[PDB]
Design a protein around this ligand. Structure first.
Ligand SMILES: Nc1ncnc2c1ncn2[C@@H]1O[C@H](COP(=O)(O)OP(=O)(O)O)[C@@H](O)[C@H]1O
Ligand SMILES: Nc1ncnc2c1ncn2[C@@H]1O[C@H](COP(=O)(O)OP(=O)(O)O)[C@@H](O)[C@H]1O
Ligand SMILES: [Mg+2]
Ligand SMILES: [Mg+2]
Lengths: 367, 29, 91, 361
């Protein structure tokens, strides 16, 4: 008999193989610590191997023989540089954001806070104010412009109807979600398992896109799950709880050795809580991009309701030309003159006339 | 102020060639 | 006067079109500065005491001297008007 | 068999020899407590010695004899004043900065924050606020104007891509790093280990330029380091967290006996956290220079995004000659007036006209 699934190294050093539901189930295979050291496998590894049914007194099948790991021939898994030893880089392969159904939104996103492979940015917005729908839009645009990249989206602490709608509108792309109905322990477990799985995939020099909903709700779920941490920070925050989200987010990077890891997460902001804004602050110094959406702009039904002024990236020249960089300088001058709601109204008038390539070059003429 | 001449877009030849190049590449492929 | 006004009138149907074209060119020259000219290399206007007409003594004459060349094209709707007319006023 | 590197005396009375990897390596060699006593050696000293391979059941190489310490014989090393009693003065040796790539930024620096050997300066701004590549610029300018000075850069709690980038783009100068990915203990180890090597290096009458990234992000990382350290101050700080950072930063000084120790570090402020701001003021009372950077400038992409008004030195005359001090006296009586944004563009244009002295010329 044969078994297949994702490695889930528990605290006792044994593993579980999940299905499409991606939590604890029963068709799991136990991989001995000897086997783990033999193939140098870490959790989240895509293991496929011959394993007879669980023997007498045995509740889960034991992986007698491994054949395919990381979709490939297993010597690579054992003989590969460790993730931490990979040489990082700045993002250099920007992702062209040219989608027809909503040209305005993705055009603005790219022209203002361009995104490349290995980007670590944050969409930062109050709740019920445009994070999820825009995440869906950019996910579809990525699925159209970069079919090569393994695109993965995680939804945390979210409404089940949104989950269903998106998974219907994901067009089969790997959509994993965690509704608010689920206990936060499940939330943390699934998020971490996705973390190591993506880590393994990048370890195979792969480009991994992760789109996370509710990074702030993620931090809150960690704080709930994190039982002590001792010192309680300003506003009731766990100090060391963030490190698991901090490890989770800082893992995103541009690696010089092939592949990439780009993660974009939804930040809830001006929610009136010191916890939320503070956590925004710690994760702000970790990310290379912030795209702010304002409550009142969304209130005026203007979409996208981007807070243009403070949104930006680092090392634009590493994704843009000096021509592009200087045109961006000039445009940001114009917009720093130009008031936010006013900015959106007149820019939506201005830019709709030409599509992302049409707009891109006709505007490099104009802007 | 007459609408027939009230607004008349003005652009130089080089930026005209840039915008028209954007027009011909606007028809992609 | 100015270089060949008769040629100017011949090459437009009605004078008010000519006036709006020359003045919009002048406004473009002012906003972008005089770098966005299309007669730069050799033939530039010149003052007497010095070479002051290189930068900006009078933009209207600059525009008219520009238009005598074939480097200027004007039309009722040659470019999507909304984009230009809503980027013009905020810089 | 020659063993080389920096001495890291372990806590158990024996020692280690660390290498250019700038962390805990396995190239370590044992220096017992008795060896410490008889040579009176300090850790971090530039050690070149003879050692022997580890024996059976023994895991780390054991030292045989010491030959070179800080490129000097041990006999002179026994006879040298320790750092604590060294007489400090105020900085006296300024550094001219007109660099061909961006003379504007360095010119603003010279006019506003003249830099002298042994200076304890500072630059303050929120996260993602114009610090690191400016640090790059000043480091490069130093690499030309003062190639003699041993220039060292420490990175704490930052993104690895920035680490690598500055690594190649510093042109081989001493760059040390500790990303936020790393556990806090590595942060502390690297930071204090750099501190102590610099202590010994200046101890030999050397001029040492320390480019510390993120002094107050270091403070936040130290709060993360801080397991308790005492009683809760406002904002979540405790009592004795600062002392190791304070002993770390206050070490910057101009010494009368030769050499210098100029440390420039970047401060994060205006983060909406009482903790962070309080650290800003409490280290403000420690440094001899602060360079403010406001965010309205940077949201406008105006660079260098310097809040010129808030910045100012201590004891200009002590570093700047009476003629130079008088001319900057007149100039500060002149330059104090103009209003922030219009100040930015008009001062930028004025320095864009000619070089600082050329402007005076
Ligand atoms: N581009 C858009 N156009 C129109 N309405 C939008 C758009 N984006 C978001 N919305 C509105 O905002 C809601 C999404 O809010 P969301 O960002 O999901 O909040 P959160 O992500 O914090 O749960 C949608 O249900 C819709 O009502
Ligand atoms: N002199 C400069 N000119 C323009 N941009 C700069 C300059 N110095 C730094 N920056 C930008 O500002 C950002 C701040 O760098 P860093 O100190 O790492 O961020 P923070 O301290 O805010 O966490 C950098 O990403 C860099 O792109
Ligand atoms: Mg939502
Ligand atoms: Mg930075």
């Amino acid at each position: 008999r044969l078994v297949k699934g994702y490695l889930e190294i528990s605290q006792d050093g044994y593993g579980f193989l999940t299905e499409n539901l991606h939590n604890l189930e029963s068709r799991v295979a136990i991989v001995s610590a000897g086997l783990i050291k033999q193939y140098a496998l870490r959790a989240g590894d895509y293991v496929v191997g011959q394993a007879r049914p669980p023997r007498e007194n045995e509740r889960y099948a034991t992986l007698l023989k491994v054949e395919a790991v990381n979709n490939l021939d297993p010597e690579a898994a054992k003989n590969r540089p460790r993730f931490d030893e990979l040489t990082p880089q700045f993002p250099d392969r920007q992702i062209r954001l040219e989608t027809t159904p909503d040209e305005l939104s993705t055009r603005v996103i790219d022209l203002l806070a361009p995104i490349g492979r290995g980007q670590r940015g944050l969409i930062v917005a109050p709740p019920k104010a445009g994070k999820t729908t825009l995440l869906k839009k950019i996910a579809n645009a990525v699925l159209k412009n970069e079919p090569d990249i393994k695109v993965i989206v995680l939804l945390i602490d979210e409404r089940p109807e949104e989950v269903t709608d998106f998974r219907e509108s994901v067009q089969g792309a790997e959509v994993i979600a965690s509704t608010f109905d689920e206990p936060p322990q499940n939330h943390i477990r699934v998020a971490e398992f996705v973390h190591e799985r993506a880590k393994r995939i990048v370890e195979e020099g792969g480009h991994v896109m992760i789109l996370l909903d509710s990074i702030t709700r993620l931090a809150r779920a960690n704080n709930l799950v994190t039982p002590p941490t001792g010192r309680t920070l300003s506003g009731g925050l766990d100090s060391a709880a963030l490190y698991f989200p901090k490890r989770f987010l800082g893992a995103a990077r541009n690696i010089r050795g092939g592949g990439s890891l780009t993660i974009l997460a939804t930040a809830l902001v001006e929610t009136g809580s010191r916890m939320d804004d503070v956590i925004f602050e710690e994760f702000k110094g970790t990310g290379n991009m912030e795209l702010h959406l304002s409550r009142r702009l969304e209130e005026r039904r203007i979409f996208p309701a981007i807070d243009i002024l403070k949104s930006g990236t680092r090392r634009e020249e590493l994704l843009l030309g000096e021509e592009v960089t200087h045109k961006m300088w000039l445009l940001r001058k114009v917009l720093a003159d130009m008031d936010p709601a006013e900015a959106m109204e007149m820019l939506l008038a201005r830019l709709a006339r030409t599509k992302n390539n049409k707009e891109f070059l006709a505007s490099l003429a104009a802007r | 102020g007459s609408d027939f001449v009230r607004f008349t877009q003005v652009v130089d030849q080089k930026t005209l060639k840039a915008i028209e190049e954007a027009r011909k590449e606007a028809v992609e492929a | 006067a100015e270089p060949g006004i008769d040629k100017l009138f011949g090459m437009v149907d009605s004078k008010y079109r000519l006036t709006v074209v020359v003045a919009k060119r002048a406004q473009q020259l002012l906003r972008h500065g005089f770098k966005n000219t299309v007669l730069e290399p050799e033939e530039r206007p010149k003052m007497q005491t010095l070479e002051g007409l290189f930068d900006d003594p009078n933009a209207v004459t600059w525009a008219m001297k520009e238009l005598l060349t074939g480097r200027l094209v004007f039309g009722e709707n040659l470019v999507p008007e909304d984009r230009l007319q809503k980027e013009m006023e905020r810089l």
